[PDB]
Tab-separated table of all heavy atoms in Angstrom:
chain	number	residue	atom	x	y	z
E	194	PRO	N	36.175	7.857	-1.614
E	194	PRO	CA	36.234	8.827	-0.516
E	194	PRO	C	35.382	8.411	0.685
E	194	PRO	O	34.509	7.543	0.548
E	194	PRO	CB	35.688	10.109	-1.154
E	194	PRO	CG	34.902	9.660	-2.341
E	194	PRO	CD	35.579	8.427	-2.838
E	195	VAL	N	35.630	9.016	1.847
E	195	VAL	CA	34.897	8.648	3.060
E	195	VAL	C	33.454	9.101	2.974
E	195	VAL	O	33.134	10.078	2.296
E	195	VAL	CB	35.548	9.215	4.331
E	195	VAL	CG1	37.041	8.927	4.329
E	195	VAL	CG2	35.293	10.702	4.446
E	196	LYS	N	32.572	8.368	3.642
E	196	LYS	CA	31.148	8.660	3.598
E	196	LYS	C	30.504	8.087	4.851
E	196	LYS	O	30.919	7.033	5.336
E	196	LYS	CB	30.512	8.032	2.344
E	196	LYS	CG	29.061	8.489	2.088
E	196	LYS	CD	28.355	7.630	1.021
E	196	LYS	CE	29.036	7.716	-0.350
E	196	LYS	NZ	29.178	9.123	-0.819
E	197	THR	N	29.519	8.789	5.395
E	197	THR	CA	28.716	8.248	6.491
E	197	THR	C	27.253	8.551	6.214
E	197	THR	O	26.851	9.712	6.166
E	197	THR	CB	29.142	8.813	7.872
E	197	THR	OG1	30.518	8.499	8.129
E	197	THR	CG2	28.279	8.228	8.999
E	198	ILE	N	26.463	7.504	5.993
E	198	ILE	CA	25.048	7.661	5.688
E	198	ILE	C	24.206	7.021	6.776
E	198	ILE	O	24.289	5.802	7.013
E	198	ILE	CB	24.649	7.030	4.322
E	198	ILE	CG1	25.419	7.669	3.156
E	198	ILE	CG2	23.152	7.175	4.104
E	198	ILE	CD1	25.078	9.148	2.876
E	199	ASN	N	23.410	7.839	7.461
E	199	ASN	CA	22.383	7.307	8.343
E	199	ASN	C	21.222	6.851	7.465
E	199	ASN	O	20.488	7.668	6.892
E	199	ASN	CB	21.968	8.348	9.388
E	199	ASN	CG	23.146	8.832	10.222
E	199	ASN	OD1	23.915	8.035	10.764
E	199	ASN	ND2	23.303	10.146	10.311
E	200	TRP	N	21.077	5.534	7.340
E	200	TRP	CA	20.287	4.941	6.265
E	200	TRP	C	18.848	4.731	6.686
E	200	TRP	O	17.918	5.206	6.033
E	200	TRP	CB	20.940	3.627	5.829
E	200	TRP	CG	20.463	3.083	4.523
E	200	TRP	CD1	20.695	3.601	3.283
E	200	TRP	CD2	19.724	1.866	4.323
E	200	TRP	NE1	20.118	2.797	2.326
E	200	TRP	CE2	19.511	1.730	2.937
E	200	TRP	CE3	19.200	0.896	5.189
E	200	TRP	CZ2	18.807	0.650	2.385
E	200	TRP	CZ3	18.501	-0.175	4.646
E	200	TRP	CH2	18.309	-0.289	3.256
E	201	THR	N	18.651	4.003	7.770
E	201	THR	CA	17.332	3.973	8.384
E	201	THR	C	17.554	3.921	9.882
E	201	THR	O	18.704	3.878	10.332
E	201	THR	CB	16.480	2.789	7.872
E	201	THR	OG1	15.086	3.074	8.088
E	201	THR	CG2	16.869	1.491	8.585
E	202	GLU	N	16.483	3.966	10.668
E	202	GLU	CA	16.659	3.830	12.101
E	202	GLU	C	17.352	2.499	12.380
E	202	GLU	O	16.883	1.436	11.939
E	202	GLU	CB	15.321	3.887	12.839
E	202	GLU	CG	15.450	3.423	14.284
E	202	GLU	CD	14.340	3.937	15.190
E	202	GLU	OE1	13.522	4.758	14.726
E	202	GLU	OE2	14.297	3.517	16.368
E	203	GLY	N	18.485	2.568	13.067
E	203	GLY	CA	19.206	1.371	13.457
E	203	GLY	C	20.206	0.867	12.432
E	203	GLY	O	20.858	-0.149	12.675
E	204	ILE	N	20.332	1.551	11.295
E	204	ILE	CA	21.306	1.127	10.277
E	204	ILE	C	22.135	2.289	9.730
E	204	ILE	O	21.584	3.260	9.197
E	204	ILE	CB	20.635	0.413	9.086
E	204	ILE	CG1	19.897	-0.850	9.541
E	204	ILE	CG2	21.690	0.050	8.031
E	204	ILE	CD1	19.211	-1.605	8.427
E	205	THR	N	23.455	2.174	9.838
E	205	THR	CA	24.381	3.197	9.346
E	205	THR	C	25.444	2.617	8.414
E	205	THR	O	26.096	1.619	8.744
E	205	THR	CB	25.066	3.898	10.517
E	205	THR	OG1	24.059	4.455	11.367
E	205	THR	CG2	25.985	5.015	10.026
E	206	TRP	N	25.609	3.247	7.249
E	206	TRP	CA	26.571	2.814	6.230
E	206	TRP	C	27.782	3.756	6.249
E	206	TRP	O	27.615	4.974	6.243
E	206	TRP	CB	25.849	2.796	4.862
E	206	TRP	CG	26.675	2.973	3.607
E	206	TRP	CD1	27.961	2.582	3.381
E	206	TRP	CD2	26.226	3.593	2.393
E	206	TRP	NE1	28.337	2.912	2.095
E	206	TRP	CE2	27.298	3.539	1.478
E	206	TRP	CE3	25.025	4.174	2.002
E	206	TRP	CZ2	27.191	4.058	0.183
E	206	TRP	CZ3	24.924	4.692	0.715
E	206	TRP	CH2	25.999	4.626	-0.176
E	207	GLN	N	28.998	3.207	6.321
E	207	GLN	CA	30.190	4.050	6.302
E	207	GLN	C	31.218	3.540	5.329
E	207	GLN	O	31.368	2.328	5.150
E	207	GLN	CB	30.824	4.160	7.698
E	207	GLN	CG	29.922	4.821	8.719
E	207	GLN	CD	30.392	4.609	10.145
E	207	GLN	OE1	29.853	3.773	10.881
E	207	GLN	NE2	31.394	5.372	10.546
E	208	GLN	N	31.915	4.480	4.692
E	208	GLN	CA	33.111	4.177	3.915
E	208	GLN	C	34.254	4.931	4.598
E	208	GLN	O	34.144	6.134	4.835
E	208	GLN	CB	32.946	4.609	2.455
E	208	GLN	CG	34.140	4.288	1.577
E	208	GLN	CD	34.387	2.793	1.453
E	208	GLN	OE1	33.434	2.004	1.351
E	208	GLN	NE2	35.670	2.387	1.475
E	209	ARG	N	35.324	4.221	4.941
E	209	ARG	CA	36.407	4.768	5.761
E	209	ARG	C	37.751	4.259	5.284
E	209	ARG	O	37.828	3.240	4.593
E	209	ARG	CB	36.244	4.307	7.218
E	209	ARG	CG	35.269	5.108	8.055
E	209	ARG	CD	35.139	4.503	9.448
E	209	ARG	NE	34.271	3.324	9.458
E	209	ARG	CZ	33.835	2.739	10.564
E	209	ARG	NH1	34.193	3.232	11.742
E	209	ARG	NH2	33.044	1.676	10.491
E	210	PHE	N	38.815	4.962	5.671
E	210	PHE	CA	40.171	4.427	5.558
E	210	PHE	C	40.632	4.004	6.944
E	210	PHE	O	40.564	4.790	7.887
E	210	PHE	CB	41.138	5.470	4.989
E	210	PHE	CG	40.878	5.822	3.548
E	210	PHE	CD1	40.093	6.923	3.217
E	210	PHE	CD2	41.418	5.057	2.527
E	210	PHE	CE1	39.851	7.254	1.885
E	210	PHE	CE2	41.178	5.379	1.191
E	210	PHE	CZ	40.394	6.475	0.871
E	211	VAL	N	41.083	2.762	7.082
E	211	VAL	CA	41.585	2.297	8.369
E	211	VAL	C	43.100	2.115	8.295
E	211	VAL	O	43.613	1.399	7.426
E	211	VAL	CB	40.900	0.994	8.816
E	211	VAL	CG1	41.477	0.523	10.142
E	211	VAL	CG2	39.386	1.197	8.935
E	212	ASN	N	43.815	2.782	9.199
E	212	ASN	CA	45.269	2.708	9.228
E	212	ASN	C	45.762	1.718	10.258
E	212	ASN	O	45.392	1.805	11.430
E	212	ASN	CB	45.864	4.084	9.538
E	212	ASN	CG	45.482	5.125	8.511
E	212	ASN	OD1	45.699	4.939	7.316
E	212	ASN	ND2	44.896	6.230	8.973
E	213	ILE	N	46.567	0.761	9.813
E	213	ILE	CA	47.291	-0.109	10.728
E	213	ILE	C	48.764	-0.038	10.369
E	213	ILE	O	49.154	0.711	9.476
E	213	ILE	CB	46.796	-1.572	10.664
E	213	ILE	CG1	46.848	-2.087	9.228
E	213	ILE	CG2	45.381	-1.681	11.213
E	213	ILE	CD1	46.532	-3.564	9.114
E	214	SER	N	49.585	-0.819	11.061
E	214	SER	CA	51.013	-0.848	10.773
E	214	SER	C	51.276	-1.209	9.308
E	214	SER	O	52.097	-0.572	8.640
E	214	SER	CB	51.712	-1.842	11.705
E	214	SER	OG	53.100	-1.864	11.446
E	215	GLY	N	50.551	-2.205	8.804
E	215	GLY	CA	50.737	-2.692	7.440
E	215	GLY	C	50.317	-1.786	6.282
E	215	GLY	O	50.667	-2.054	5.123
E	216	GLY	N	49.573	-0.723	6.578
E	216	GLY	CA	49.118	0.192	5.547
E	216	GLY	C	47.735	0.769	5.783
E	216	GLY	O	47.148	0.592	6.849
Side-chain angles (χ1 to χ4, degrees):
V195 312
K196 190 192 298 306
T197 301
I198 300 293
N199 303 310
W200 195 70
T201 202
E202 167 158 354
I204 299 180
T205 303
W206 154 32
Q207 297 165 258
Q208 182 64 39
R209 278 177 282 191
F210 292 95
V211 178
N212 300 306
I213 54 173
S214 181

